[PDB]
Amino acid sequence: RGPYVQADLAPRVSVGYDFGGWRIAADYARVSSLGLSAIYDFQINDKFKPYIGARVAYGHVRRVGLGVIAGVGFDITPKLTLDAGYRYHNWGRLENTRFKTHEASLGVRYR
């Protein structure tokens, strides 16, 4: 695919590049909020398909955490694409669960 810009809305400004199955792009929001976003998929069809990935959130001038995303996305054309789903937020502490959150949001990719 190539380079492209991503957006998050429930806004957040993200950017990165993709190829087809694995897409990489960082997220930024307003001290400032900086994080990484990574989407992955493995399905083929006409349009509108599921998607799963992970993203980390890092806040500092502190809010350091890691979460995941998953849902469904569609796009009639390669230029612009739309996605929607839910994402969980993990604070991080131990390796046996403790505190996890979940929210619903949608994003869009544009040139």
Swiss-Prot record:
It comes from the Bacteria. It is found in: Cell outer membrane. Coiled coil: none annotated. Pfam families: Opacity. InterPro entries: OM_autotransptr_brl_dom, OMP/PagP_b-brl, Porin_opacity. NCBIfam families: autotrans_barl. Implicated in a number of adherence functions. OPA proteins are implicated in pathogenesis and are subject to phase variation. Belongs to the opacity porin family. This is Opacity protein opA60. The gene is opaH.
